[PDB]
Amino acid sequence: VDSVYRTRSLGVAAEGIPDQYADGEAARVWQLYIGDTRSRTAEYKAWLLGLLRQHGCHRVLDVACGTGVDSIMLVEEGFSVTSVDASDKMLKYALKERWNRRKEPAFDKWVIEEANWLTLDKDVPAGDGFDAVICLGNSFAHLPDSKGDQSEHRLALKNIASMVRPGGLLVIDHRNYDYILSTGCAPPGKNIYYKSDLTKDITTSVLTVNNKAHMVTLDYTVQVPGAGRDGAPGFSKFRLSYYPHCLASFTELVQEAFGGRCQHSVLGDFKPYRPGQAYVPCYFIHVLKKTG
Amino acid sequence: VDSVYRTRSLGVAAEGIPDQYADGEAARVWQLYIGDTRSRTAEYKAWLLGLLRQHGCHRVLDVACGTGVDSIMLVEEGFSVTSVDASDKMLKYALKERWNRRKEPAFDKWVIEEANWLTLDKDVPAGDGFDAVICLGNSFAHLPDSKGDQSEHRLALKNIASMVRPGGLLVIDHRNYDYILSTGCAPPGKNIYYKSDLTKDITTSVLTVNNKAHMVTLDYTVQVPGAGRDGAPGFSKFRLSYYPHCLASFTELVQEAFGGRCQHSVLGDFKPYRPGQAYVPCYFIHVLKKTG
Amino acid sequence: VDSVYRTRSLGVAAEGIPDQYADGEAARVWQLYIGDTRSRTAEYKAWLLGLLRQHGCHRVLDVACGTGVDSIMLVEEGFSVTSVDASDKMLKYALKERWNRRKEPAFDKWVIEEANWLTLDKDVPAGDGFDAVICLGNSFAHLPDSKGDQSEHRLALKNIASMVRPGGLLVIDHRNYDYILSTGCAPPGKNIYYKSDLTKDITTSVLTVNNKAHMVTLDYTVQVPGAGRDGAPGFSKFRLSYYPHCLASFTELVQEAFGGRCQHSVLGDFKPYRPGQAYVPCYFIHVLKKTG
Amino acid sequence: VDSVYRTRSLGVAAEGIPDQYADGEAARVWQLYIGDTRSRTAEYKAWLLGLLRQHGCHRVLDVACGTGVDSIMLVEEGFSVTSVDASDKMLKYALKERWNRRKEPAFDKWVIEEANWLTLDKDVPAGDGFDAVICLGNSFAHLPDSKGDQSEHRLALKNIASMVRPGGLLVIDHRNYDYILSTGCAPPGKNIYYKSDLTKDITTSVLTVNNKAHMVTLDYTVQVPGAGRDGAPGFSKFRLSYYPHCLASFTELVQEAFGGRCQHSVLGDFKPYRPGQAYVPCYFIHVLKKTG
């Protein structure tokens, strides 16, 4: 940048806290999108639990709470979890669940609050920090690169990492965009995080600005059970936008978030991942262990 | 007893008259975008004039008038031209020009009216028709494919062709999208239609929906002479969207517009074009000659 | 002998679920707007409780829950209350409160759900009905008369009344619009429902369409404690719109909601009200007792 | 902690011009709205011409050109007129007219350019000034009082006055808002400036903010000849907003624009006006004669 900036300000304000779930439709049918939460959680439940235990983790912070899917599981499995999320439309359901099982000592001590990765540091006073932090379900990819540089990405990734107690863990994932970008289309159905026969369609939309992948927009079509007598089925339609993080780049990004003081590894779909391997994962789970 | 009959559906996007130049910023600086109209017109002036004359053309209809660039030239060259355009923001300047030279017999008799390809048939009563029709400057590509099918494209192309008197000519062009789509980026500066050192930047933006190129959006940055004392330069920014017509497809489309009753040919940048040729043209000029 | 036609009875496109509290700013500072909930509730607490008791009411439905102000009081006073509201942004706080006191048997049995007067009948299965229904705080006036006729008003008022068990009560209020319309301005500070020194300003805005009061829009300015070091105070600004219900009209409307099978009465600010009386009430509390 | 009073006032509202005629619908049917321009101009033609002549006026500047109605008349009557207007959508038609009669020496020398009262001083170099300035047809009332104080009004009124050569005239009018505000409704049909049987309806809309008239919004319904076969008539709908200038206030405002160096007078509908007079004028024509 030339010269010095003394008077920035903003004469035009178009965008502003853009909560993609503010409309509320995605939340209303998330359950329908996920399908059988038990069937979903069945996969990687063993791995996540095993990993958490192997590193003696008891305090877990879920920064992508959503409707509570994984927070709930960790709660049931005896962990001390606190869940945050920026969308009060989503949290609204996790809360609903907690209240429903408010008579279970475990759930009584479940913490659910609103927070944003961009301002996590101030939203969730980590203090000593957590034994483990989780960002599953392709949540981070929602963060856009509006500023031109992945600054936002870096900041958010930093704050999140800042919640990991030394020797703690960070499990953050993202869709396999190395494939979506290559084929223009996102994998059809049979997803480990979202496996519901209710989801009738997912239309991709890749936007490369000046020859560089800038954004992937998915348009979902989830059939709301019923929505019309026999002969007329009804559906719900919502759209979500993600930054297509290529594996290599994220690996670098996330690692940098820890200032290199960490141990990085990545699995395909919670299975070991070696480039060139036959199996093409739909998600890439990054496992980081802070050391200093 | 079913019902009556309809043409449109209850799901397609009917848009809302979307004049991309309605905002007026593009018009305000078009002159700056084109640069030296004389230098511009210098190229292809010989060819256009030569072609028009070779086919004894006197009545010329310009469906992409814009600010009048090519209509003015044809007027000065003794042709009987009538120019139409959908943007009254652009026409506004051609008009301004005509009035300025209202004392030149040639210009008195210059006709400038508003019209839209989609409704050309009713906007411009061709009656007998024109000896030649021109749509230069990558104007047609503006028409979107909202309806799902290139229906709009077909209709507009039909109306335009319908203005060509039998034996008449139709010179319609478009950017070389076979290259833009391939590289993601549009060629930098040094354009035959727009050659101005004032244009500092043109950022592309390819949007492929479900693996199919759907739209190319260019974001221009033209420096408005002055716009700040020495040390601080000022610019103007506007965006235009085009349907990326691949050569082969357009050839087919435009030909069909004449019901096959025509003679088709296409030049690179007003030079002969042979696929695989070294030179990569920035535009593709289609020359059609109605026969029946 | 068999027909055809179409739909669309309205002329404009209207808004679409227009939750005035959807933005969330009014909720965020409602507490600041009300002031000392205890001080507020102090007034009319005796009357409300006295009235409820005098008619042997135990089951109370609060259709204007809001942040829970009056639902909470009723809960504490040993009533069996269920609260509904259309704004999940407001309810969000009542919920928050209930959870906080989740250890109090009373609050454990407090029911809080989302609902809309327009669809109350389906949102809250009254079944047998409630002993009393309350709509305090000038909440009903939010309902607009978009349809041209007070149809919406009539429907909502009907649904609400439909929740009152025979012999039950309905306490519904509204601002004294007979005065606002007359003076163009709403009363300044010192309100029985909202008494906070934090509210710095309330700008009225009367919109009479073709000589008939159509809407009153209030623009609030509530100082958020702090919002700047000494020397610089910070405020929050939000707007709410109400239909200016003139007393006489509402009396008629609400009574009609009960099909005349009721006993109507209205108090000034929870004090007896006689037209022409010196004291000018800020609100009008309508007390209805269903008989059949 | 630098300076609270730098230049003027740091507004964070908007930064766009709000051309009420930008949409273009009002222009498209203005002709229909006015009706018989000849019949319209018939009234006050004698007065205007007489007044202009009585004060030896030859150079006339029309700041509310519109479609050219009154500019055209003055041109035909041998005056040297230059017309400006902010709406290029309206001017577009005056221009169209001038070109049509481009062969009439009179019209050849007719000047039509875009300009805004707010920046008149820089848009139209008055230099020596004009013998007379006209702002007829309730045009000035369009200027809003967004800034809170009638600053804009004062500035615009100043610029306009600044175009009047000493000893020159200024004819500026406005609707009788003292009546509209009183009755809520605007006079029905039979207007001196707009007398067309095509205008089927004009719905008012008075917005008084905190008991002070802030804006009058009129919603017009003009039948576009035809717009449907026999049995189905078609109309066009547009809305315009005005600041309800009460007579007394405008007299004060406009006079101040001349720094008191003027001779003021006001007529009803181009007839003498005495308060309390039986006849209720629809417009108030202010006649000012600069003296110094």
Ligand SMILES: C[S@@+](CC[C@H](N)C(=O)[O-])C[C@H]1O[C@@H](n2cnc3c(N)ncnc32)[C@H](O)[C@@H]1O
């Ligand atoms: C795909 S959803 C998660 C669904 C859930 N994890 C599951 O597995 O079903 C992504 C979540 O990211 C959250 N999110 C997006 N941007 C955020 C931010 N800046 N701070 C906090 N949460 C954010 C949203 O609120 C959204 O619920």
Ligand SMILES: C[S@@+](CC[C@H](N)C(=O)[O-])C[C@H]1O[C@@H](n2cnc3c(N)ncnc32)[C@H](O)[C@@H]1O
């Ligand atoms: C790139 S500009 C032309 C510039 C000019 N031809 C030149 O060479 O400088 C494209 C023009 O297409 C016109 N246009 C777009 N859609 C149109 C439509 N449906 N009917 C008529 N004109 C249309 C616009 O008004 C715009 O001026």
Ligand SMILES: C[S@@+](CC[C@H](N)C(=O)[O-])C[C@H]1O[C@@H](n2cnc3c(N)ncnc32)[C@H](O)[C@@H]1O
């Ligand atoms: C002024 S607030 C109530 C504040 C609270 N009663 C108090 O006394 O502080 C009005 C409430 O009406 C509710 N409301 C408006 N329209 C509604 C509708 N159609 N159905 C249900 N609630 C509605 C809103 O959600 C809003 O919280």
Ligand SMILES: C[S@@+](CC[C@H](N)C(=O)[O-])C[C@H]1O[C@@H](n2cnc3c(N)ncnc32)[C@H](O)[C@@H]1O
């Ligand atoms: C009611 S119309 C005039 C119609 C015409 N005078 C007649 O008598 O038929 C008002 C005109 O005021 C013009 N106008 C509004 N604000 C303006 C401004 N700030 N500067 C210049 N013209 C303005 C508009 O462009 C509009 O054409």
